[PDB]
Amino acid sequence: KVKVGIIGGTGFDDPNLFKKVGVRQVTTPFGKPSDTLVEGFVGDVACVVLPRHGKGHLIPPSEVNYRANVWALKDLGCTHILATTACGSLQEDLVPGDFVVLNQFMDKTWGRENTFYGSKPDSLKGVLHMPMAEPFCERTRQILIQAARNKSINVYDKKTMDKSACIHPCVHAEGSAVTINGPRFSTRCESFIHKAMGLDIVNMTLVPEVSLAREAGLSYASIAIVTDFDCWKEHVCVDMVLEQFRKSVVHVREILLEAVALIGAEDWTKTIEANKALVMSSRQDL
Amino acid sequence: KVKVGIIGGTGFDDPNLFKKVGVRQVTTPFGKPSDTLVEGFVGDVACVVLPRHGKGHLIPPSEVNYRANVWALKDLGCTHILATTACGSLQEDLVPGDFVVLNQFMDKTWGRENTFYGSKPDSLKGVLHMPMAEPFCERTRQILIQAARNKSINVYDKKTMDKSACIHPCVHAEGSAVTINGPRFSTRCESFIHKAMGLDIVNMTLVPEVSLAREAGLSYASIAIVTDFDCWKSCVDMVLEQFRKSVVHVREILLEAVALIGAEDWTKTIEANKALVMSSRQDLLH
Amino acid sequence: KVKVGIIGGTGFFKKVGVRQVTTPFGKPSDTLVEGFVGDVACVVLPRHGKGHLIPPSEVNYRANVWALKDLGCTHILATTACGSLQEDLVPGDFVVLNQFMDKTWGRENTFYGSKPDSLKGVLHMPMAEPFCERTRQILIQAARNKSINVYDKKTMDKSACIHPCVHAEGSAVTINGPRFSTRCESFIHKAMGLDIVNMTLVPEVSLAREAGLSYASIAIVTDFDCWKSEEEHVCVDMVLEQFRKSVVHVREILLEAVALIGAEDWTKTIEANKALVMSSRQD
Ligand SMILES: Nc1ncnc2[nH]cnc12
Ligand SMILES: Nc1ncnc2[nH]cnc12
């Protein structure tokens, strides 16, 4: 029934979340995934892990085969996808070492395959217009947040708490990402424009991954690791992965493993059926 | 002599604006148009209709061959293009069931062929930089608005009328569209950003259609149908019936607009359309 | 030593010869003119080719930058025509840019990736201040040396703005083209606080940094885009008429800037340019 896929970003190229049971070199109608998929169990919950950028981190954000990654996880029976992403902060209260359970995004990517459906031969037949107002699976979002609570990691909810309750390092219970195409980081001019728009963090990999997960009928939630402030305060590759970030990986692993258990502890029949019905009801050719 | 092409969007996949005299199954130097073009008359005015998404609505917005559609209409001697588009509202006074005769846009599309000219072997030779300050044919916009008046539909001009003149359903006498690439709808984050920029509606099909019409020397005007509020604002059977009624009204507007176009001389406007292309050829002026 | 490449846009020394080169990323826009400014080697490359037949979205920026790198250039000075989005930047002015916002798409914007037509690797370049500051200041000093007014918004104000002037800083929005902006887009860009709009700065500036080169751009204001009156709305004739009046000033600045670069030592700067590339490899 429930099976949890995990897409590991920067810092999660060889996650070792569970003892490896099987290794799947698979293909999809949309090509090869970033790497082999590793299947196993967390407790009694089947789980599948794949590194977004492949082994050795050779695939840049704009060239990841998001379609193949999501479709391959779905083909293996995944009902959920938990994903990590390293990001820069655009706001004073989002400090390096914090995490963010995202609930919103603004898309500035281009040139990436962002839908399974279309009119050309390398796509599924149909025109699919998915609602994306709240683009994540809210139930799965709350499980990431509860998992943090269960692992004694501070949770800061701006809606029900004051700024004095923002004790770092903390998990931010909501937040918006602007997803840029990369590979370059933002200019200071771009960073201030994103901040003035009210965006919380900037990354390169959330879109179209989040969109395709919903197209596939899967429940998707992302946990973003704040690795540095973006250049409005500067961001470098070495800074995006440092001693704080090495500590961040430890706690993100604990959140992910606890989130998988928490997913497995609940019935998802109605949510899964709703995910599938949202796809069929978004077809405008039918 | 004038000849009006009509590109029908959602709700116009198979319109019967007139008894079809002939059909033209053609291709263009830029590929196949979305469907067979249907030829006929409104009164004594020659007319040509093609559905933007093809019959059966199998072609999504980013895959529509805008170049082929415009070129095919130009090849048949069209002097004008009237186009429809179903859109979401970004503003409180643009209510489902209203219409907008667009006069402005912000472009957020990518990955679409948006010009007939370039340095590639299959493009027309030359560098064409068209002015787009006011990107529609203003004379044809005013015909659409007058057609609405002639068909007893309210017209609301916010530049001269108090918001107490905004009586629904109404044709908004001006408005701006943000054209997103699709196929997904916007997030709430994106919707509120577009709203804060002052954009009136969101759609997926205006650009590059409007640009290519001007490149082709054709007078282009768009009438948008507001089908719903975009997701900045938090049953379906009522919305569907409302859209059906909107299609009936837009069909009335198109039929009257064709007659009004035929009732005037367009020699000078057509010549100015063609001169604007020649004066935008940077390679010739250099 | 130093060697300065010049990438000249719309309508834009002792000439020794013309050279055709190939690159791993294709052919440059045109042949390159090799020569000297005093004792400094200099190479001139027309961005849009002879006859201006290549539109901004189709310029092979990777080839142009790599061609100059392969010839041993340490610096690239670039020009571009642009539209002003702000009252105090008027046609005939110049802007030594220091910032940009990118609205381009569909252009090859990096030398590195996982496809066979790119260099193997994942390169995430910092771009907070995307130009070479030393080279920007040389463009400004060159204008001073040629008796062209310099206007600095951080220390002067509109009352002290003498045209035609070189604006000592400024941000560009780079749009993909080939069409000019709508009024709606122009006002949105202006409300974001951008100074000018153009079509060719990106990915040229990004690829220069990827190649370890010092890059600075001087933009020529040819028009007010289309946020003003209808008689002031941009079109090709308007851009070309003003560009022809401003070329000789751009010439004087660029040629003076080449001499000023050659008068200084760039050893540590060049080292830092190269080291920045190496430290940005994530693979
Ligand atoms: N500042 C930043 N911008 C974009 N992606 C990032 N990933 C980590 N830090 C980032
Ligand atoms: N207004 C403008 N927009 C874009 N590119 C330009 N080049 C010159 N003027 C321009």
Author numbering:
A (entry chain B): 3 to 235, 239 to 291
B (entry chain C): 3 to 236, 242 to 293
C (entry chain A): 3 to 14, 20 to 290
The authors write:
Because the S. mansoni genome does not codify an adenosine phosphorylase, one alternative to fulfilling this activity is 5´-deoxy-5´-methylthioadenosine phosphorylase (E.C. 2.4.2.28) (MTAP). This enzyme catalyzes the reversible phosphorolysis of 5´-deoxy-5´-methylthioadenosine (MTA) to free adenine and 5´-deoxy-5´-methythioribose-1-phosphate (MTR1P). The observed overall fold of SmMTAP is similar to that of members from NP-1 family of low-molecular weight purine nucleoside phosphorylases (PNP), which consist of a central β-sheet distorted barrel surrounded by α-helices, as observed in other MTAPs from human and bacteria. Furthermore, a comparison of the KM levels reveals that S. mansoni MTAP can use adenosine with the same efficiency as MTA, which is one fundamental difference between S. mansoni and its host and reveals a potential target for schistosomiasis drug development.
We also could obtain the structure of the double mutant S12T/N87T in the Apo form and in complex with adenine. However, it is intriguing that subunit E of the double-mutant (S12T/N87T) and subunits B and C of the S12T mutant were found in the open conformation, even when they were bound to adenine. In some structures, adenine does not bind in all subunits; the only WT structure whose BBS are all occupied is the orthorhombic SmMTAP adenine complex. Interestingly, in the S12T adenine complex, the presence of adenine does not cause the gate loop to close (subunits B and C); this is also observed in the S12T/N87T double mutant subunit E (the modes of adenine binding in these structures are shown in Fig 6B and 6C). No significant differences were observed between double and single mutants. Even in the double mutant structures, the position of sulphate/phosphate was conserved. In the double mutant, the KM is increased approximately 12.3X, kcat is reduced 2-fold and kcat/KM is 25.7-fold lower than in the presence of phosphate.
